[PDB]
Design an enzyme around this catalytic site. Structure first.
Site, mmCIF file in Angstrom:
data_model
loop_
_atom_site.group_PDB
_atom_site.id
_atom_site.type_symbol
_atom_site.label_atom_id
_atom_site.label_comp_id
_atom_site.label_asym_id
_atom_site.label_seq_id
_atom_site.Cartn_x
_atom_site.Cartn_y
_atom_site.Cartn_z
ATOM 1 N N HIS A 1 2.734 9.624 1.829
ATOM 2 C CA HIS A 1 1.328 9.368 1.563
ATOM 3 C C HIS A 1 1.035 10.287 0.399
ATOM 4 O O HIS A 1 1.617 11.372 0.310
ATOM 5 C CB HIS A 1 0.454 9.773 2.741
ATOM 6 C CG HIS A 1 0.511 8.821 3.886
ATOM 7 N ND1 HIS A 1 -0.333 7.737 3.991
ATOM 8 C CD2 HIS A 1 1.316 8.782 4.972
ATOM 9 C CE1 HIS A 1 -0.054 7.073 5.099
ATOM 10 N NE2 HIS A 1 0.941 7.687 5.713
ATOM 11 N N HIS B 1 8.376 1.839 2.361
ATOM 12 C CA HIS B 1 9.014 2.316 3.575
ATOM 13 C C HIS B 1 10.519 2.300 3.473
ATOM 14 O O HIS B 1 11.096 1.413 2.853
ATOM 15 C CB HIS B 1 8.616 1.421 4.747
ATOM 16 C CG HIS B 1 7.178 1.535 5.135
ATOM 17 N ND1 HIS B 1 6.576 0.670 6.023
ATOM 18 C CD2 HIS B 1 6.230 2.433 4.782
ATOM 19 C CE1 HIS B 1 5.317 1.031 6.200
ATOM 20 N NE2 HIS B 1 5.082 2.099 5.460
ATOM 21 N N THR C 1 -1.868 6.451 11.173
ATOM 22 C CA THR C 1 -2.915 6.797 10.216
ATOM 23 C C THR C 1 -3.496 5.629 9.420
ATOM 24 O O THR C 1 -4.313 5.830 8.524
ATOM 25 C CB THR C 1 -2.441 7.893 9.236
ATOM 26 O OG1 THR C 1 -1.311 7.429 8.493
ATOM 27 C CG2 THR C 1 -2.050 9.149 10.012
ATOM 28 N N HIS C 2 -3.060 4.412 9.734
ATOM 29 C CA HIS C 2 -3.601 3.218 9.093
ATOM 30 C C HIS C 2 -3.472 2.050 10.064
ATOM 31 O O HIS C 2 -2.698 2.115 11.019
ATOM 32 C CB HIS C 2 -2.922 2.921 7.731
ATOM 33 C CG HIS C 2 -1.454 2.629 7.801
ATOM 34 N ND1 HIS C 2 -0.939 1.527 8.452
ATOM 35 C CD2 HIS C 2 -0.393 3.268 7.248
ATOM 36 C CE1 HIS C 2 0.375 1.501 8.297
ATOM 37 N NE2 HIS C 2 0.731 2.545 7.570
ATOM 38 N N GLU D 1 -2.302 13.809 4.380
ATOM 39 C CA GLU D 1 -3.246 13.242 5.333
ATOM 40 C C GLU D 1 -3.747 14.375 6.219
ATOM 41 O O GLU D 1 -4.952 14.583 6.357
ATOM 42 C CB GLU D 1 -2.582 12.123 6.139
ATOM 43 C CG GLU D 1 -2.141 10.962 5.245
ATOM 44 C CD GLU D 1 -2.111 9.629 5.961
ATOM 45 O OE1 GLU D 1 -1.289 9.465 6.884
ATOM 46 O OE2 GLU D 1 -2.918 8.743 5.596
ATOM 47 N N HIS E 1 6.307 11.452 6.305
ATOM 48 C CA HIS E 1 6.238 11.038 7.701
ATOM 49 C C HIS E 1 7.571 10.464 8.149
ATOM 50 O O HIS E 1 8.087 9.533 7.534
ATOM 51 C CB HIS E 1 5.129 9.999 7.884
ATOM 52 C CG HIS E 1 3.754 10.586 7.860
ATOM 53 N ND1 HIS E 1 2.617 9.819 7.745
ATOM 54 C CD2 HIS E 1 3.335 11.872 7.949
ATOM 55 C CE1 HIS E 1 1.555 10.605 7.761
ATOM 56 N NE2 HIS E 1 1.963 11.857 7.884
ATOM 57 N N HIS F 1 0.814 -1.217 0.000
ATOM 58 C CA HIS F 1 0.000 0.000 0.000
ATOM 59 C C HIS F 1 0.849 1.269 0.000
ATOM 60 O O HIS F 1 0.329 2.376 -0.161
ATOM 61 C CB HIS F 1 -0.908 0.007 1.228
ATOM 62 C CG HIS F 1 -0.163 0.015 2.530
ATOM 63 N ND1 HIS F 1 0.243 1.178 3.150
ATOM 64 C CD2 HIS F 1 0.259 -1.003 3.320
ATOM 65 C CE1 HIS F 1 0.882 0.877 4.267
ATOM 66 N NE2 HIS F 1 0.905 -0.439 4.394
ATOM 67 N N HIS G 1 8.383 7.614 5.322
ATOM 68 C CA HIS G 1 7.635 7.184 4.152
ATOM 69 C C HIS G 1 6.740 8.342 3.756
ATOM 70 O O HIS G 1 6.790 9.407 4.376
ATOM 71 C CB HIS G 1 6.791 5.950 4.478
ATOM 72 C CG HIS G 1 5.790 6.171 5.569
ATOM 73 N ND1 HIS G 1 5.914 5.602 6.820
ATOM 74 C CD2 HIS G 1 4.651 6.898 5.598
ATOM 75 C CE1 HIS G 1 4.894 5.974 7.571
ATOM 76 N NE2 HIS G 1 4.115 6.761 6.853
HETATM 77 C C1 LIG Z 1 9.733 -1.398 10.063
HETATM 78 C C2 LIG Z 1 8.406 -1.531 10.795
HETATM 79 O O1 LIG Z 1 7.679 -0.304 10.515
HETATM 80 C C3 LIG Z 1 6.514 -0.095 11.208
HETATM 81 O O2 LIG Z 1 6.046 -0.845 12.022
HETATM 82 C C4 LIG Z 1 5.842 1.224 10.890
HETATM 83 C C5 LIG Z 1 4.576 1.551 11.654
HETATM 84 C C6 LIG Z 1 3.954 2.876 11.320
HETATM 85 C C7 LIG Z 1 4.529 4.082 11.786
HETATM 86 C C8 LIG Z 1 3.925 5.327 11.492
HETATM 87 C C9 LIG Z 1 2.714 5.376 10.716
HETATM 88 S S1 LIG Z 1 1.940 6.917 10.361
HETATM 89 N N1 LIG Z 1 1.192 6.796 8.947
HETATM 90 O O3 LIG Z 1 0.961 7.068 11.432
HETATM 91 O O4 LIG Z 1 3.005 7.892 10.328
HETATM 92 C C10 LIG Z 1 2.152 4.164 10.250
HETATM 93 C C11 LIG Z 1 2.778 2.910 10.556
HETATM 94 ZN ZN LIG Z 2 2.330 7.744 7.455
#
Ligand SMILES: CCOC(=O)CCc1ccc(S(N)(=O)=O)cc1
Ligand SMILES: [Zn+2]
Length: 258
Positions: free
Chosen positions: A94, A65, A197-198, A104, A117, A62, A92
């Site tokens: 969005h 990263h 956010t997900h 977002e 982010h 989706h 990452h």
């Molecule tokens: C390498 C493992 O990486 C994770 O577990 C990332 C988790 C994760 C961190 C931040 C966000 S957000 N969209 O709220 O900034 C979503 C998911």
């Molecule tokens: Zn994010």
């Protein structure tokens, strides 16, 4: 996965599998500047990242990263509303179907083209990301709004790496990179208690939203959407969008550092 951004498994339906989606500390949110509360207790944001911690870039279906080694404090975030040091572990983006939307968070109802982010976890109180991920004060994410305009050269290394992780699951080494170079010149910010956010949508994120945006071109955004959500061999399914609609503030107060 049992969730995505499609009509059937999208944000609007996430609550069925993840009830917290309708929680009281959900993100993102619309920041109404007329209602923000300026706090003098907030110190400036301080970021010190070691390029040597960059590790790998991954197509997670989706989104994609860029992860970092998080075994020590070579890369950390401090200041702002934090008393503890937070350890960097990933960054990452969005984006949306078209330039009209994609970010977002929104400011006074204005939607931007994408959002960056930069995530960190509380290594002062917890031992691992896994542990911190579900703690109220476990995560810290810096959000930077990306306004469509001139091409952003600082995105080059990242953009150039996508051709190696075109399909779901693909991942490659991504090293010697300091993400602080993607941040805006000014670090004035807004902060509020929020969540991922997900899914799993844990309400464990202290958000740091930069007042200043960074640029990105229509073509650079096209590169993000050029990524595929399918596994190699299946018919291509472009990664068109991955931004969640803004959620109810529900009493929360957004503080401003400026
Ligand atoms: C390498 C493992 O990486 C994770 O577990 C990332 C988790 C994760 C961190 C931040 C966000 S957000 N969209 O709220 O900034 C979503 C998911
Ligand atoms: Zn994010």
């Amino acid at each position: 996965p049992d969730w995505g951004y499609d009509d059937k498994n999208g944000p609007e339906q996430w609550s069925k599998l993840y009830p917290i989606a309708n929680g009281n500390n959900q993100s993102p949110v619309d920041i109404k500047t007329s209602e923000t509360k300026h706090d003098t207790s907030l110190k400036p944001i301080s970021v010190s990242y070691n390029p040597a911690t960059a590790k790998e870039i991954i197509n997670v279906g989706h989104s994609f990263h860029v992860n970092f080694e998080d075994n020590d404090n070579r890369s950390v975030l401090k200041g702002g509303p934090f008393s503890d040091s937070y350890r960097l572990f990933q960054f990452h983006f969005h984006w949306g179907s078209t330039n009209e939307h994609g970010s977002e968070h929104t400011v006074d109802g204005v939607k931007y083209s994408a959002e960056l982010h930069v995530a960190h976890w509380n290594s002062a109180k917890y031992s691992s990301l896994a542990e911190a991920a579900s703690k109220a004060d476990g995560l810290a994410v810096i959000g930077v709004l990306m306004k469509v305009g001139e091409a952003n050269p600082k995105l080059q290394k990242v953009l150039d790496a996508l051709q190696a992780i075109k399909t779901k699951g693909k991942r490659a080494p991504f090293t010697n990179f300091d993400p602080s170079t993607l941040l805006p010149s000014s670090l004035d910010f807004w902060t509020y208690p929020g969540s991922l956010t997900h899914p799993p949508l844990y309400e464990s994120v202290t958000w740091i939203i930069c007042k200043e945006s960074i640029s990105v071109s229509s073509e650079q955004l096209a590169q993000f959407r050029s990524l595929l959500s399918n596994v190699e061999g299946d018919n291509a399914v472009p990664m068109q969008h991955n931004n969640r609609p803004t959620q109810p503030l529900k009493g929360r107060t957004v503080r401003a550092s400026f």
